[PDB]
Amino acid sequence: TTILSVRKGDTVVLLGDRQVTLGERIVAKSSACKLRRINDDVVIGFAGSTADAISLMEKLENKIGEFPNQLTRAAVELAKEWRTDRALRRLEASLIVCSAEETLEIDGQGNVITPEADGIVAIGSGGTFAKAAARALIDVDGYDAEKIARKAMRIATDIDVFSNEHWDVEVLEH
Amino acid sequence: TTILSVRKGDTVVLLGDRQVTLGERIVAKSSACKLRRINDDVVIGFAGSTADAISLMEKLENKIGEFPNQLTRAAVELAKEWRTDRALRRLEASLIVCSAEETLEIDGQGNVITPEADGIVAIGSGGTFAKAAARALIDVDGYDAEKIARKAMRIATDIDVFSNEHWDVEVLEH
Amino acid sequence: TTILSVRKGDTVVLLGDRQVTLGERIVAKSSACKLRRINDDVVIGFAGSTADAISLMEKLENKIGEFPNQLTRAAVELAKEWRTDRALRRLEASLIVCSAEETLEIDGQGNVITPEADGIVAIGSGGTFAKAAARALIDVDGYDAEKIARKAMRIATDIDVFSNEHWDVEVLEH
Amino acid sequence: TTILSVRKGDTVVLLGDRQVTLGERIVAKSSACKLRRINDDVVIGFAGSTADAISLMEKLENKIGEFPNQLTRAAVELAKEWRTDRALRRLEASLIVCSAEETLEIDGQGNVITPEADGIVAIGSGGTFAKAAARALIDVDGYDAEKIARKAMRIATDIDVFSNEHWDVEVLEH
Amino acid sequence: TTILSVRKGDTVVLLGDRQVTLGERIVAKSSACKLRRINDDVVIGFAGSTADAISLMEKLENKIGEFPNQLTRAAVELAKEWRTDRALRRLEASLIVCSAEETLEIDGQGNVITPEADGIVAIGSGGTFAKAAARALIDVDGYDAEKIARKAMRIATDIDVFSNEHWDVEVLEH
Amino acid sequence: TTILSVRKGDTVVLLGDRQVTLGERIVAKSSACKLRRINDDVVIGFAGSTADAISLMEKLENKIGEFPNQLTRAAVELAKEWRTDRALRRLEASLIVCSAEETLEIDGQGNVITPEADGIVAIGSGGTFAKAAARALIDVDGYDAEKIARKAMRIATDIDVFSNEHWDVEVLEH
Amino acid sequence: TTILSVRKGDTVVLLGDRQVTLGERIVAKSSACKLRRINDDVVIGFAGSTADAISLMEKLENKIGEFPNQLTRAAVELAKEWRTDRALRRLEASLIVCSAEETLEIDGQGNVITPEADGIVAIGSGGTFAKAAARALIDVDGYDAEKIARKAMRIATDIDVFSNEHWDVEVLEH
Amino acid sequence: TTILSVRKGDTVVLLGDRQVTLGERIVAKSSACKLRRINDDVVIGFAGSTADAISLMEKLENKIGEFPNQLTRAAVELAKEWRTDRALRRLEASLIVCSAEETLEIDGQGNVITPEADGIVAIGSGGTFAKAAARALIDVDGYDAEKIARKAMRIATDIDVFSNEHWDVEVLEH
Amino acid sequence: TTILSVRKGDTVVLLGDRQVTLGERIVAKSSACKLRRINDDVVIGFAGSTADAISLMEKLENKIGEFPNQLTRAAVELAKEWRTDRALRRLEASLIVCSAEETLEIDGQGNVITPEADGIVAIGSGGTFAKAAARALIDVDGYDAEKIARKAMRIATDIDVFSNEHWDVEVLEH
Amino acid sequence: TTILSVRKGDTVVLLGDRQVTLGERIVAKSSACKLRRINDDVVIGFAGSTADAISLMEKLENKIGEFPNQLTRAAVELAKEWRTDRALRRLEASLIVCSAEETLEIDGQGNVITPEADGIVAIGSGGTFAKAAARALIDVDGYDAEKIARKAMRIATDIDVFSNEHWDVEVLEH
Amino acid sequence: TTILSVRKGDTVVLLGDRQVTLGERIVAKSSACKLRRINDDVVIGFAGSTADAISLMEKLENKIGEFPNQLTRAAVELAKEWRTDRALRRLEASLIVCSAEETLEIDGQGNVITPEADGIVAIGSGGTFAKAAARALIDVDGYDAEKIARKAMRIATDIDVFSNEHWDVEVLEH
C-alpha cells in the first residue's frame, strides 16, 4: 500500500493505490478504494484490511464528534484508545487523516505524526518512497500539490511490489 | 480447499471441492460438502473446518437479517465483528458469499473482496490456481459460467494437493 | 492412541487401545479404558487425557440431550461450542461417537467427519494405520465388522509406538 | 523430585525425596517435605513448588469433601477443574494421592492414572526410575512394600540429579 | 510418495506412485516413474528427487558390482558410504531394492530394513498406510502379491496427499 | 519471476518476465532479460539472481556438450552435480531448458520435470499461476502456443507481485 | 532402544531389543538384531542406525587390533577419533563393548563409561530404566546375571515406547 | 542482586547490595536500597524492580496482618496468591523475609524456602555465591553473623557482575 | 549507507555518505570515504565494511584487467566468483561501478543490475529513498546530474538513520 | 563438575568430583576420575567428556614438551591452537593445569586465566561455588590448602546437582 | 571490556580495564591485562579472549613486518585476511592499534576505523560510554590525554557491568 498526502499552498491532496495483497504474495484485488470521505471537511486513507481500517475509522468518528473542531485532539484520543483497548490492539492498520488545515498520521504503535513544513505525510509499504519523491518536488515552482502527488505515486508504486498504478484522489481547499 | 465463483452474463456459479485434510498430510474425508444454501437468493462456500465455518455462517445470517437487501454491508459488518470479537478471532476460515447480484469474499484478516469486472472470486489453497484458469477462459465466447468453472476446478484441484476432483455446484440467475 | 470404528451390515463396532503415554516417551499405564457408554444407544471413544476427554464428553451429553436423535447435529453443536469457548479450547482431544445409525469424529480443529460409504472412522496417532488396514478388509465377504476391527487394531497398534495390543470393544446393532 | 508409592498386601507406602532445585541447576534446600497428611485416611505427595502444590491440594480437599469415599471421583473432578480453570492451569505440579484402598496420580496434562496390578505409581523427574526398580522387586520374596520403596528410592535418587537421598515416608493399612 | 513391495509365495512385486510435489503444496508432475530396473534380477524404487535418488542408485550399482550376489551386503556398504560421505549426506532419499530372494529398504538415517515374515516393505509419505493395508491382506484367500499391492496402493494413495493414483509395477519370480 | 514454456504442435515458446526484486519488497529493475539462447537449438529461462543462474547455465552447457543430443540426460547430469557439489548447492535458482523436441525444468531440490502431454512447464513465484492459465487454453481452438503463453503471462504476472508485465519471448520449431 | 549388560560372578550378559523406529513414531522393524560378536572374546551392542553403528564398530575393530588385550585403551582411542574426525561426528550411536573381563560404554559426546562395582551398564532410550531395575536385583542372591537382565529388560521395554519385548542375548565367562 | 541472610546464635542479619541494572548491561543506580523494615520485628529484602518488589511487599504485609505471629503461614499465603493471581504473576521478584525467629525465601515459582540448620538463605544473581561463602564460615571461630555476611557479600558481589560493593544491613535479636 | 549514481546527458556522478554504524545502533565514524577511483575511467562505491568491500574491489580489478573494455563482463565474472567462492561468500557488501559509458550494481545475492533509461542506480539502507527522489527530478528542467544527486542524497540521508549528511562525490564525462 | 585448585604457602592442591552426567539429567557414573598426572611436576583437571579432555591433554603435552619450563607459554600455545583448529573447536572442555609454581585455567572460549593473589582457580558447573567458599577461608590462619579445598568442595558439590561428594586429590610442593 | 585511546597534542594513551567475564555473568579474573606492547612504537589493546586476541595480534605482526612503516596498510591487510580466512573468522575480538602517529580500530565485521579529529577511539561493551565521556573533555584546556582517559574510564567502567575499575595504561609520544 501507498497512501500519500501533500499540502502545498491552499490545496491538500490525498492519494492511495488500489492493490490488495494476500500472503504477501498475490494480488487479490487491483481496484480497492483505500480513501474515505468521513464528512465534507475530512478525508482519510488507510493501510490494512477493510475491517480493521473501518473499525478504526468508526472510533475516529466518535472522537471527531466528541471534539468537533480539534482534529489533532481527536487523533490523539483515538491513538490512546487504540493502544489501551484489548480488541483494537489486535487490529493492524495505519491511517492518514486530512482536513484543509491539518494532516495526521496515526499508527498501531501509537505514533501521531504531523508533517514537517513541507506538508508531506505518507504510510504503507510504499509510503516512504512516495515521501522521498514528493520531497524532491515540493519546492519546485510550478508543481502544485496534485502534480507532486501523482508523480510521487508513480515512482513509489513502481518500486513497491505491494502497491499498484491505479490511484484514488481526494482534494481539499479552505 | 478450492472454492471458486464465476459470474458471466446472467449466471453465477459457485463450486467447491470435497477434500478434508488433517495435519496437512492426510485425507480424512473425500466427500465433504463446502457449500451452503442460506436462503433462496444466497449461497456460501467455505474454506476451514466445519465448526469454524458454520459459526461464521451463523453470524453472517444475523447480519444478513439485520441488513435485508444489502449483502455488501452485511459482509462488512460480519468482517468487523470477526476481527474485534475475541472468540471469533480464534477461528480460521474464509468465505465466499453469492447472490445473483453480488459476490464477496471475506477472510480472517478482515479483507472483503469483490471481483473485478471478470466476475471471478476464489479462496482456499487452490483458489488462486482456479482463478488464473478461469481468467483465461472468461472472455472466450461459447464458454458459459459453469463450463468455465468446471474446467478451472479440474485444473486447480489437479495442482493443489489439498483439494480433490469431486465438486459441488450451486447456480443462481435473476 | 488408536480408536477405530467399523460399520458393516447391521453391526458397528468401536475399539480402543489402552496405553497412556507421557512426554511422548514412557508408558504410564497399559490398561486404561478409552471408551464410554453414554447411554444404551451411544458409545464414545477418545484420544487425549482423561480430564480433557471427560469434560468434552459431558458437553456432548448436553448436546445429545438437547437434540435427542440428531446425533450429527449434537456433534456439530459440540464442535461449535468447543471452538468458541475459551476454557474448552485449552483442551486437547479427539472423539469418535457411535450409534447404530451414525458415526462421527470430532477434533479440536473443529472438523466433524462422517465416514465414507465404507463405514470406517478412526482417530489417534495410530488411527490412520487402522483405517488403512480396515479399508483393505471392508469389502472382503466373510469378514464382519468385529473381525475387521480386531485385525486392523493388531496391525495399527503394532506400528504405532503410542498404542498397545490390549483393546476394549463396544458393539451396537438396531 | 521423586515421589513413589507402593502397595503390597495390606500396606501402602508413599515416599518422597527432599531436594528443592532452582533453575534446574542448584539445590536451594535439601530437607523439604513433599508429603502431606490430609486426613487420617489420605496422604498426598507432590512434585512442583510449595505454593502450586498446596493450591491444588486445597482444591483436592474440596473435591474429597464433596465425594466422601470416592477418592477416584474426587481426583477426576480435580483434574477437570484443573484443566478448565485459567488460574489453575498456570500451575505446574503432579500429585499422588493415597488411601489404604486406592492410589491415583494426577498431572497437569489431565491424566489420572491408577496403578497396574503391581500397585506401583510414581512421579517427578526420578519417578520412572523408581518405578522400574520397584517393579523389579514387587514380586520378590522377602520384600514388603516399605522395603521395596526404600530400595527403589535409593536407586532412583542416585540416578536423578534432581532428587536427593533423604526421604519422607507415610504408611497406610486398613 | 508411496513405494510398496510385497513378497508372497514365489512372486515379489514393487509398486510406486507417479506424483512429484514441490514446496509440499503443488503437483509439478503426475506421471513420474519412481522405479528402475538395474539388471534382470534387481529393481529399485525411490522416494526423493530425481537427482538425489539417481546419485544413490549409481552408488548402489557400484556396491552391487563389488558384491555380486550379496544384495544385503551391498545395501549395507551403500548405507555406510552414504552416512560417512559429505556430498551424499546432503542428499535426501529412501530406497527399496528387490531381488527375487531379498528386499531391503535403505534410508538417509542409515537404517537398512528387511521385511518381517509377511514380506512387506514400504517407504515415502504414504508407505506406512500401504504397509498397514498390505498387512491386512497378506494372509487372506484370493490375494496374490500383485493383488495385495494394488489394493494397498489405492488405499494408501487415497489417504496421502503426496501420492497419486497412477502406479508403476515391477514383478520378479525365481 | 514467471518463466513459462508452452509446446503446441510444432512450436514451442519460452517466455519470461523482467522484474528483479530485492528483499522480497522492492523492484530494483523492470527490464531484466531472464532468457538466454545457448545455441541455435536450445533456449533457457531462469528464476534466481544473475550470477546464480549464469553459473548454472554454464554447467548446463558443459553437460550439453558432453551429451550432444540427449538434452534430458544433460539436465539430469546437471541436477546430480548441482546437488552434490558444495559451491553449487549454495546457489538458488530454477531453470527451464527448451529445444524443439524437449522441455525440462530443473530446480535446487534436484527435481527434473518434463511436461505432461499438454506441453506446459513453468517456474518462479508466478509459474504455477501461468501453468494453470495455460492449461485452460491448451486444448482450445484459435490458440497457438504463443497466444496461449502471452495470455497466461498476463494473468500470472497480474497476480504475482514478484513478476511484471514486460516479457521476453523465444520460439523454436523443427 | 534398550541395550543392557550385567556382570555378576563369572558371567556377563549383553541383551538388546529388536525394535527399529522411524520419525520417533512408527515401528519399521520388530526383529532387528542390535548385538554383534566381533570375535570369540568380544561382543558389542548398539543404539543408532545400522550404518552408523557398523561404521563405528569397524573403527573399534581397528583399534582393538592395534591394542590387542587392552580393551579400555581401544575404546578410548575410538572415542578420541570419533570426536575429532569430521565424518564420524556426523554419526549418531552409542555402543556397549563386553569381554569377560571388561565392559565399556561409549557415546557420541565422547564419554567412556565403565560400570560401578555392580557390573551394570546400559544405553538407549530405555537403558536407564533397565539399569534401575537391574540395580534393584543385582545383590539379591539366587538371581544370576541372565535372570537379572531378562527381568530388567521386560520392565524397561514395557516402559520405553521405543523398545520392544523381543531380545537378543549374548553371554561370556572366563 | 545479592540479598543474603545469616542467622547465628541469637543474631540474624540481612544484607543487600545497591546496584540496579538495566538491559542486563548497564548500572543505572549504584545506591538503591533493597531492604525494608516492615515493622519492629520484621525486615525484608528483594531482588527485582522497585515496583514489582513493593507490590509484593504490600501483599505480604496484608498477609502478615491477617496472620499476626505466624510468619511462615503469611509467606505461604502470599506465595499462593502470587502464583494464582494473573496480575501478580506478571511480576518478577524474589523476597527474603526475616524475623528474629524465622527466615523465609519466596520466589515467583512459588517456592517457600527456609534455611538448613546453618541459618543461611540467599537470593538474586549473586545469592548462591554468597551462600557458598557464608556456608564456609558459618561454623568457624571468630565469625559472628554480621562478620560472616560481610565477608560473604564481598566475595559474592566481586563475582556477580550484577551486584556491587555497597551494602545495606539490617540486624535482629530476641 | 547511501550510494547513489545518476547519469544525465554526458555526465555521471557517484555519491556516497560517510557514516559507519556498528551493531545497527551507534555511529563509530562520521567521515569514512565509501568511493574509490580504480583508474581514470572507473569509480566505485560500496556499502559494507572496509575489509569486505576492498577484498571485492580487488577481485573486481582482476576481472577488469582480464576483460579490458568490457566492464559489464567483468562485473558478471566478479559476481559469479563471489557467489561460488567459499571465502568471498562470507563477505557482505554491495558495489556500484561507474564508467562514463556504463553503471552496474552488484550485490551479495548475485544480482547485477544496470539502470533503466533514467540512468539511476543506488545501494545501501538509504539507496532506495535516494533513487525515488532522483527519479522525481531526472526529467526536470534546471537539474543536471550533480544537482539531482545532491538533492536526492539530502532527502535519502535525512530519512535513513544509517546514513549521514556528509557526502563524497565523483564525476565522469567522455 | 567441580574442579578446584587452591595454592596456600608452599602447597597447591587440585581436587575434582567424580560424577558423570548425561542429558543434563542422569548420573551415568559416580566414580570417574577427572584429574591426571602428566609428569612429576604437573597435574591437570578437566570438565568435559573423557575423549574431549584427553585429546586436549595430549595437545597440552605437545606444547609442554615444546616449551619445557614455561607452563604459561605452553597453555597459551594450546589455547591458540584450540581456537584456530577446526577439529579441536568441536571439542567441549575446560582444563586447570597446576605446577608447584603456576596454575592456569584454559577454556574453549580461549581464556587463559591465572588466579588472583589468593591462589584460587576453579571450573565446571560447580566451580564458582567452590571458589566463593575457598575465598572465604583462604586468609583464615590454621586452614591449609587441603583443608580449604575439602571444605569448599563439600559446599560446592552440595549445591551443584551436576557434581557429587566423592573427590580425587592431587598435591604439589617445591 | 573497555579499551580507550585518546590522542591529544603529541601524546597518545591507550587504556584498558582488567575484568574477564564468563557466561556474561561472573568475573573469573579481575587483574587481566588487555594491552600488549608489540614493539617500541606500537601498542595494542583487545576485547575478546586471550587466545583469540593473541592469534590476531600475531597475524598483525606479520603484516606490520611486511609493511614496515605503513601501520594503516598493515591493519587493512589484517582485516582482509581476517574476513577471508576460515579459521580466523571463527575468532571473536576487536583491536585498537596505536603508534605515535596513527590509531586504528579493527573488528570482526571488517571495519577499520580511524578517529575523527578529536583523536578518540574505543571498543568493548564499555567503549562507547568511554568515548562519550572523552569527547566531552577533549577540547577542555588543561586536560591532557592521560587525564581525559582516566576520567573517561572511571565513568565508562562504573556504567558497564562487564568492565572493572582497574586499568592498564600505555603512553606514546614522537
Ligand SMILES: [Mg+2]
Ligand atoms: Mg508496484
Ligand SMILES: [Mg+2]
Ligand atoms: Mg488435488
Ligand SMILES: [Mg+2]
Ligand atoms: Mg505399539
Ligand SMILES: [Mg+2]
Ligand atoms: Mg541425586
Ligand SMILES: [Mg+2]
Ligand atoms: Mg493422493
Ligand SMILES: [Mg+2]
Ligand atoms: Mg505483477
Ligand SMILES: [Mg+2]
Ligand atoms: Mg515398549
Ligand SMILES: [Mg+2]
Ligand atoms: Mg560485582
Ligand SMILES: [Mg+2]
Ligand atoms: Mg540520517
Ligand SMILES: [Mg+2]
Ligand atoms: Mg551435588
Ligand SMILES: [Mg+2]
Ligand atoms: Mg563495572
